[PDB]
Amino acid sequence: RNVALITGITGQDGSYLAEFLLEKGYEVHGIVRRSSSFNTGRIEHLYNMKLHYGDLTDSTCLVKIINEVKPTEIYNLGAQSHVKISFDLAEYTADVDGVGTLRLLDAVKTCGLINSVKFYQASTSELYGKVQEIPQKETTPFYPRSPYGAAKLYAYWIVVNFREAYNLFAVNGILFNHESPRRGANFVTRKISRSVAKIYLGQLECFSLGNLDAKRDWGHAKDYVEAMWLMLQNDEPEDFVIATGEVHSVREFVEKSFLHIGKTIVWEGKNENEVGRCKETGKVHVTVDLKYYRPTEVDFLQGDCTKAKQKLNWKPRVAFDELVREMVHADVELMRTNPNA
Amino acid sequence: MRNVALITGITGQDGSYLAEFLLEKGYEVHGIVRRSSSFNTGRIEHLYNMKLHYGDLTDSTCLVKIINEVKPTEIYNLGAQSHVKISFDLAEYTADVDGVGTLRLLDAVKTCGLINSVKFYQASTSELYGKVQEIPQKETTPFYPRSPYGAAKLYAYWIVVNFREAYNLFAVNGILFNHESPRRGANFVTRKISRSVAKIYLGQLECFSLGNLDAKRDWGHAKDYVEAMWLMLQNDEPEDFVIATGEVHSVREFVEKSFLHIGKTIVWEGKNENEVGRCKETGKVHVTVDLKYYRPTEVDFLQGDCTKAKQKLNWKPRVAFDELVREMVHADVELMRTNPNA
Amino acid sequence: RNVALITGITGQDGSYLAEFLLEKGYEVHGIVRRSSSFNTGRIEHLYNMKLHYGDLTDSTCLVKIINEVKPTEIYNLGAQSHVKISFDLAEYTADVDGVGTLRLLDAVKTCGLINSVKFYQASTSELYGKVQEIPQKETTPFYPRSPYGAAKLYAYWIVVNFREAYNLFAVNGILFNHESPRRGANFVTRKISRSVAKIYLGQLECFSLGNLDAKRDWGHAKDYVEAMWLMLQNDEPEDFVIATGEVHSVREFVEKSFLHIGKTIVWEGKNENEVGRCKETGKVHVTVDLKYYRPTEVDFLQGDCTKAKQKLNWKPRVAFDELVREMVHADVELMRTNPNA
Amino acid sequence: RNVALITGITGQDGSYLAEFLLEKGYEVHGIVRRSSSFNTGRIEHLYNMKLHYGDLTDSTCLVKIINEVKPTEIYNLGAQSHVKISFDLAEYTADVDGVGTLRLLDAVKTCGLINSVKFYQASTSELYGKVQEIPQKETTPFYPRSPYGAAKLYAYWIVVNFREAYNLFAVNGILFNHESPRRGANFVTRKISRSVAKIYLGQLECFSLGNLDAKRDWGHAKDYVEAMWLMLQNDEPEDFVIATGEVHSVREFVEKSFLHIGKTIVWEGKNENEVGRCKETGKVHVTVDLKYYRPTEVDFLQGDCTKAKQKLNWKPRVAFDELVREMVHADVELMRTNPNA
Ligand SMILES: NC(=O)c1ccc[n+]([C@@H]2O[C@H](COP(=O)([O-])OP(=O)(O)OC[C@H]3O[C@@H](n4cnc5c(N)ncnc54)[C@H](OP(=O)(O)O)[C@@H]3O)[C@@H](O)[C@H]2O)c1
Ligand SMILES: NC(=O)c1ccc[n+]([C@@H]2O[C@H](COP(=O)([O-])OP(=O)(O)OC[C@H]3O[C@@H](n4cnc5c(N)ncnc54)[C@H](OP(=O)(O)O)[C@@H]3O)[C@@H](O)[C@H]2O)c1
Ligand SMILES: NC(=O)c1ccc[n+]([C@@H]2O[C@H](COP(=O)([O-])OP(=O)(O)OC[C@H]3O[C@@H](n4cnc5c(N)ncnc54)[C@H](OP(=O)(O)O)[C@@H]3O)[C@@H](O)[C@H]2O)c1
Ligand SMILES: NC(=O)c1ccc[n+]([C@@H]2O[C@H](COP(=O)([O-])OP(=O)(O)OC[C@H]3O[C@@H](n4cnc5c(N)ncnc54)[C@H](OP(=O)(O)O)[C@@H]3O)[C@@H](O)[C@H]2O)c1
Ligand SMILES: Nc1nc2c(ncn2[C@@H]2O[C@H](COP(=O)(O)OP(=O)(O)O[C@H]3O[C@H](CO)[C@@H](F)[C@H](O)[C@@H]3O)[C@@H](O)[C@H]2O)c(=O)[nH]1
Ligand SMILES: Nc1nc2c(ncn2[C@@H]2O[C@H](COP(=O)(O)OP(=O)(O)O[C@H]3O[C@H](CO)[C@@H](F)[C@H](O)[C@@H]3O)[C@@H](O)[C@H]2O)c(=O)[nH]1
Ligand SMILES: Nc1nc2c(ncn2[C@@H]2O[C@H](COP(=O)(O)OP(=O)(O)O[C@H]3O[C@H](CO)[C@@H](F)[C@H](O)[C@@H]3O)[C@@H](O)[C@H]2O)c(=O)[nH]1
Ligand SMILES: Nc1nc2c(ncn2[C@@H]2O[C@H](COP(=O)(O)OP(=O)(O)O[C@H]3O[C@H](CO)[C@@H](F)[C@H](O)[C@@H]3O)[C@@H](O)[C@H]2O)c(=O)[nH]1
């Protein structure tokens, strides 16, 4: 009996995880939000899958769904997941990402599933924020730098407390940045791949970014959802960093993306006056706008996933260069078939 | 001089039409949009005078920030979990958004010192009449809600009344009866029918299932009804108004008329959950009934009397039921032809 | 098997209801709020009674408690019950009095008790607000005049919807004002009885009130909790007005209270300048202060409880004059024994 | 212009802080919860003080109050502060102690007071939970062990984020256990002092406790509220541990408390069968009950307040033995004057 409940099934990770579990013959249940528009674009090709209307702020819907489904595995991926937006939506973010995690854990307990459920929490490298060690591993102290980070920190610790207090098999995947062709359009990697694709097709000339010097450890969502499953296959409930260990700047992401459409970016100017110019044509394609900066930036992330390599035998398959290629190529195809986004 | 609107629910059916209507009048239009993991501004993307702000009706702080920054002259609270069937499984969220959310917005107006400068429109509803206590229903008909949606909207109606009476806020309840359009949510009955009929016409679908075929509704066009919202805020006195067509049709009639527009005459056979709708010309079944689409407490009949609005606002509906059905089926044929996955 | 769960057990009504049910051999459970101070003064003499920490805004505690207790009868008396305070606490009042009622109902459903629980909702004459009929009965249209009234109206209707949708035996007691020596100190009747008692004992000289012309139908809480029980003994779940049918002003309450300590109040002046003077001494004991007025006053309430008389055989035992006497007498004793009481 | 807003003014700390600030000529505002009973016992002797109805779960009331008062200093002491109760009230505790802190900070920002307010957060030694260093100081990593601890951790970090993001003068006082004659009756120290006082006066024979071997660093609330004020007088917004550095067991608190009424406790038995007998009379006065244990106990706390000593010149005046004496003596007087106190 293999029955998964995925919160956040409509998101990037949820959509890949649903595919991965379906291929293994799981019965997959997802919680979807009511919307005035179509909102199941990433999973519509899959309808073994059942969707249920719910929200992580509605305690009764969560108990009803868990009590009806009686899952063997719960993946809490549901969240207001955007860091910049969390500064203007601090309270909603706290209620969904922090308190919502508690609601789900409490529903497990309320439904008498404390000894049968395995629970995965979507923890995050944003917890390290202003990094206290380089690289960051499971024992690096946390230092959040946004309302999102603070809410995720609550979630991390309440999960730990349920494991310790009630012997719930509950784990924190401390996943570093992961991307894909299904990545939200207002995250930096997809913003770049979409804009580069549009420039290639003559639908756009120039776009603006924020902090070009931010550095990230970027992997592929499809690899990372497998690690989530492996953490629940472990005999003991343990927390794990999942990451590539390799660091690149936003600037490098831009450079590599443009090279895939035959353009070499050369930078000129500094800070908010910095521009990225195509060497071959002389045309400006990238500018900087201060409005995209965060009040408290996370400058640098680099994960050490030695523990996961040893215990889970997990290794990332997609490296940064192939990630950039796949994203630009996919968005060229997407924008060619349909110029409207 | 200064005409600045704040629309909650700007991404929805009504919000998108209201935004166009106000922009045409030279308003500066602000909208509150929810964060989503997917694109969610499809009904208003052609418009970007318009500024969008991330917010949620359950986050009191975001609402005060936005109202304090924008300082609107007009607020239209259209934001809601608006689906009645879904409200039975999302009762608490529905209460928090549709009921308490209305209070949050009113309180933000007061907190920001705008009680004497803002005109506030609340999206009230014929669902308030529920198990109807008079036929037709007018402003003085007693309410009798029949869902967690209806109950939440009733709270909202009364808290609006209380702000008007307590603090002299110009605040009004539009008691709007069902209104539809080509932008209507796909899981409301009218659009579900028009989309499914369009798909059948184009060979993309053979058959679809519905719930209670005997429900009766007063159906108008969203584009006409957003004008009434604006007129209620142009009034010298803050008054509540029923807005409706006065004409009643069944779900069954909506199905029949929709199919006639693609050259098919539906004839029904069987009863209750075994009832089917068959094309007379071909003998093929196109409509079945499934109990899962029924509501635990149905609203059987609505018919609005908008005499007060006719007299005071000079508002009259322009689109009648038959033209509404035609426009919806025709628009969804065009939509599904251009894109079979829409 | 007779097992009651009372929300609001620490309040006026809860304390009387708990005694009444205990006398009948019920197992009585109460939900009590955590407080930094002692808060069980009305029920401490009773500890068949079990208390549970909870709150009507905490969905998980309610499911846990209902699932553990498995009550046959639930009395939802828990509320922010003060009308004037509801104007400054509008949202909290909505969450507790409105949404809290839904949470309790949904917990009944979630726990599989929809066909075994009988549910009493504490509805109220405040629903009639700006009265549309005189007297008011079950069929009088509602017209709330406060955030409290609006929240209670939501609660009334969501109860009706659970009864109609799921065949829950759920009822609205539409109780008119009821008082006692245990009445909250900042309601008008108890404010008067305490202040009059203090004046009698030389602990106070004068106090201020708001609208002296408000008129109310006043009964005794001890009689009214019996009606709540009777409504759950009914074969069919029906809503009932409970009231005396007799109307008196705040001014009369003041006059009658002072007569019990040997003072005849004579009024002079109008509106906010009106004062109440003891005829025997010439001393001013009552003034008016605009801060005690409500933005939207409820001027007049008078209940017609014909339906309850016919179907429940309920009749009020304590009339207004005895209510005034009991309250002043009790507060004299209270303030004599303890001047800080 | 010195205007303080105290959330939690009715609690232990709030009541001492209010006195301390009033003595300095502050205008003091407090947020008080609506209650069905009298709940201002600790501050009634003070009414320069203005009280406002509010709740930390009602965002609108908090903005209204802050906008009206325009405080120069805010002390966020309001909380569901009981650790054992937090396990059954996990969600409410998260909403009040965690999200409530954010609501207050956001109201400061919304009201345009980011550059004029100094904000004190009531952080706590419970953040150290399963202690990662002994003694614990500002740089010891946190490890919460309850829903209370997890909620307070959110609050700690969201305060840090407002300081770093918007240059708000905002500080975390990391206060270790502090007690007084006004301590809540269900905390262990006051439970002991009240029960011992009752035994001395013949109002009780025996009481039950939980984990007798837990160890704590106990100081006096009156000393600790002064540190809160000093942290806001600092030129730079800094976080500080406040503690005695001296550790004692619950068992020692029992022994020392009984000594003060002329009784020597001698223990017999183990675990939940352990009892405490008066050596002089042979009578049993203490038993153990498993229901008082916590699912995830905090076994040991010991604070290092070196930083506060150096920068604030703060030193605790009351040591453990005098604290025990003051509490037992005060509760003897209290229970003698009023057996129901
Ligand atoms: N991608 C990364 O680099 C990364 C790294 C570490 C951790 N994380 C975290 O991992 C999880 C998955 O990331 P992602 O990239 O897949 O995020 P995403 O694409 O933004 O997806 C978010 C999902 O959560 C749902 N959601 C939002 N608010 C909700 C609510 N109130 N109730 C129920 N569901 C709600 C969204 O629904 P809608 O579709 O309706 O908006 C969506 O399905 C998130 O928790 C994220 O914070 C991400
Ligand atoms: N159509 C009718 O016949 C009718 C009749 C009377 C009254 N009403 C009411 O009138 C209004 C407009 O109806 P409609 O057909 O335009 O509804 P709709 O298409 O379902 O639009 C609902 C709007 O509310 C927003 N919303 C939902 N939850 C929200 C939250 N928590 N915070 C902020 N915004 C939120 C939606 O955002 P998303 O797009 O992100 O979901 C959407 O923009 C609603 O209040 C509805 O209940 C409708
Ligand atoms: N008295 C009347 O004339 C009258 C008439 C009609 C209806 N009502 C309604 O009938 C009920 C009983 O009236 P009453 O005079 O006994 O009221 P009351 O003395 O004010 O008692 C209210 C009770 O509700 C509890 N409570 C408040 N907030 C709560 C929360 N958030 N979670 C859980 N419990 C909470 C209170 O606890 P604390 O003690 O901790 O505050 C108290 O036990 C109330 O619902 C009231 O609104 C009263
Ligand atoms: N004492 C310690 O050893 C210690 C150490 C470190 C930190 N702390 C923290 O320091 C602060 C002061 O402690 P204390 O011993 O004075 O606590 P306490 O006596 O339990 O006082 C708690 C205060 O918070 C109020 N409160 C609770 N929930 C509230 C809500 N939802 N909205 C508004 N106010 C609310 C209480 O009101 P009611 O009176 O109505 O319940 C009370 O005034 C607390 O934040 C506590 O968690 C305590
Ligand atoms: N979104 C965005 N980011 C930009 C832009 N210009 C520069 N940046 C910088 O790129 C960097 C990456 O920003 P981003 O792509 O928006 O992702 P961020 O790191 O902020 O958050 C993502 O990864 C986290 C893992 O650490 C997850 F927890 C979280 O849920 C989410 O999936 C930042 O430093 C940002 O400041 C710009 O125009 N947009
Ligand atoms: N949605 C839906 N409704 C179905 C179906 N089969 C039959 N029906 C019936 O059609 C009728 C219409 O259902 P509907 O189109 O879903 O709209 P409903 O009347 O329930 O609510 C709409 O109109 C209200 C105005 O009265 C608004 F306040 C509300 O926000 C929303 O816009 C019902 O009687 C329903 O039971 C069916 O398959 N889907
Ligand atoms: N509390 C209070 N009320 C005052 C004062 N001076 C005059 N009044 C008037 O007395 C009248 C009675 O005020 P009251 O005693 O505060 O009770 P109110 O009628 O507002 O509410 C009580 O009864 C309701 C039943 O209809 C319950 F639902 C509700 O929960 C609560 O138990 C009002 O018209 C008020 O304006 C005064 O100084 N305090
Ligand atoms: N309350 C209580 N505690 C008991 C009992 N028997 C043994 N104990 C033990 O005493 C110890 C002290 O329990 P306590 O007196 O309940 O205080 P605790 O340390 O749990 O919490 C207090 O101090 C914290 C600082 O660390 C504050 F953050 C918090 O707000 C609060 O003021 C525990 O180990 C407990 O298990 C007993 O019967 N009741």
Q: Which domains does chain C have, with CATH numbers?
A: 1-183+219-246+298-318 (3.40.50.720), 184-218+247-297+319-341 (3.90.25.10)
Chain D contacts of C186, Cβ < 8 Å? none
Distance CA A171, CA A163 (A): 8
Q: What DSSP character marks residue C98?
A: I
Q: What DSSP character marks residue A72?
A: S
Q: Which residues have CB under 8 Å from A333's CB, separation 6+?
A: none
Distance CA D59, CA D61 (A): 6
Query: Does the beta-carbon distance from A59 to C60 stay under 8 Å?
Result: yes
What are the tokens at C52? 């549970």
Write phi, then psi, for C239 (nearest 5 degrees): -90, 145
Dihedral of the alpha carbons of D311, D313, D314, D320, in degrees to the nearest 10: 120
Q: What is the DSSP string of A204-266?
A: -S-EEES-TT-EE--EEHHHHHHHHHHHHHSSS---EEE--S--EEHHHHHHHHHHTTT--EE
* Residue D148 annotated in active site: yes
Task: Tell me whether residue A331 is annotated as binding.
Answer: no
Distance CA B98, CA B57 (A): 8
Q: Which residues line ligand 3 (CB under 6 A)?
A: C 7-14, 31, 33, 35, 39, 55-57, 77-81, 96, 122, 124, 175, 177-178, 184; D 35-37
- On the 0-12 / 13-18 / 19+ scale of CB atoms within 10 A, D297 is middle
Distance CA B101, CA B96 (A): 6
* Residue A148 annotated in active site: yes
Q: Which residue of D has its CA nearest to B101?
A: D60
Q: Which residue of C has its CA nearest to D45?
A: C340
* Cβ atoms of B178 and B249 closer than 8 Å: no
- Parallel, antiparallel, or unpaired: how do β-strands C248-249 and A284-288 relate? unpaired
What is the residue type of B305?
D
Chain B with chain D: Cβ pairs closer than 8 A = 23
D86 lines ligand 4 (CB under 6 A): no
* Secondary structure (3-state) at D134: coil
Distance CA B229, CA B232 (A): 5
* Secondary structure (3-state) at D275: strand
Task: Tell me whether residue A183 is annotated as binding.
Answer: yes
- CA angle, B152 then B155 then B158, to 5°: 150
Residue nearest to atom 23 of ligand 6 (CA): B178
Q: Which residues line ligand 5 (CB under 6 A)?
A: A 81, 83-84, 124-126, 177, 186-189, 191, 209-211, 214, 216, 250, 292, 294, 297-298, 301
- Helix and strand element counts for chain A (H, E): 11, 15
Distance CA A277, CA A264 (A): 8
Distance CA A31, CA A46 (A): 15
Chain C contacts of B60, Cβ < 8 Å? 91
Q: What DSSP character marks residue A5?
A: E
Cα(B139) to ligand 2 centroid in Å equals 22
Chain D contacts of A151, Cβ < 8 Å? 154
Distance CA D130, CA C317 (A): 60
- On the 0-12 / 13-18 / 19+ scale of CB atoms within 10 A, B142 is middle
What are the tokens at B86? 């879904």
List, as residue ranges, the binding site of D.
Answer: 8-13, 33-36, 55-56, 77-81, 92, 152, 178, 183
**Cis? peptide before A135, omega within 30° of 0:** yes
Task: Tell me whether residue C12 is annotated as binding.
Answer: yes
Q: Sign of dihedral through CA atoms D219, D222, D223, D229?
A: positive
Task: Tell me whether residue C178 is annotated as binding.
Answer: yes
Distance CA B4, CA A325 (A): 45
What is the residue type of B146?
R
C175 pairs with which residues across the strands?
C124, C242
Q: Which residues have CB under 8 Å from D182's CB, separation 6+?
A: D12, D15, D16, D42, D221
Greatest Cα-to-Cα distance within chain B, rounded to the nearest angstrom: 66
- Parallel, antiparallel, or unpaired: how do β-strands D178-179 and D207-209 relate? unpaired
Q: Sign of dihedral through CA atoms A243, A245, A246, A249?
A: positive
A218 pairs with which residues across the strands?
none
Distance CA C275, CA D317 (A): 53
**How many Cβ atoms are within 10 Å of D195's Cβ, its own excluded?**
23
Residue with the two structure tokens 């899952």: A71
Residue nearest to atom 38 of ligand 8 (CA): D209
Distance CA A101, CA A159 (A): 8
Q: Which of A307, A296, A261 is nearest to A281 (CA)?
A: A261
Q: Which residues have CB under 8 Å from B48's CB, separation 6+?
A: none
Distance CA A263, CA A260 (A): 7
Closest ligand, as measured to the CA of D32: 4
Distance CA C53, CA C35 (A): 10
* Secondary structure (3-state) at D61: helix
Q: Which residue of A has its CA nearest to B338?
A: A338
Residue nearest to atom 17 of ligand 8 (CA): D187
- CA angle, A270 then A275 then A279, to 5°: 125
Distance CA A144, CA C279 (A): 70
- Parallel, antiparallel, or unpaired: how do β-strands C27-32 and C49-53 relate? parallel
Q: At what angle do helices A100-110 and A59-69 cross, to 10 degrees?
A: 40
Q: Sign of dihedral through CA atoms C255, C257, C259, C262?
A: negative
Catalytic residue among B8, B27, B127, B256: B127
Cα B277 → chain centroid: 28
Distance CA B12, CA B16 (A): 6
Instruction: Report the length, in residues, of chain A.
Output: 341
Residue with the two structure tokens 């206060």: D175
Distance CA B235, CA B216 (A): 32
Radius of gyration for chain B, computed over Cα atoms and rounded to the nearest angstrom = 20
Distance CA C124, CA C239 (A): 11
What are the tokens at C283? 């001393």
- Parallel, antiparallel, or unpaired: how do β-strands A248-249 and A215-216 relate? antiparallel
Report the side by side order of strands in the sheet with C275-278. Answer: C207-209, C284-288, C275-278, C265-268
Residue with the two structure tokens 């059948």: B200
* Cβ atoms of B177 and B242 closer than 8 Å: yes
Residue from the list C99, C149, C161 with its beta carbon closest to the beta carbon of B146: C161
**How many Cβ atoms are within 10 Å of A297's Cβ, its own excluded?**
16
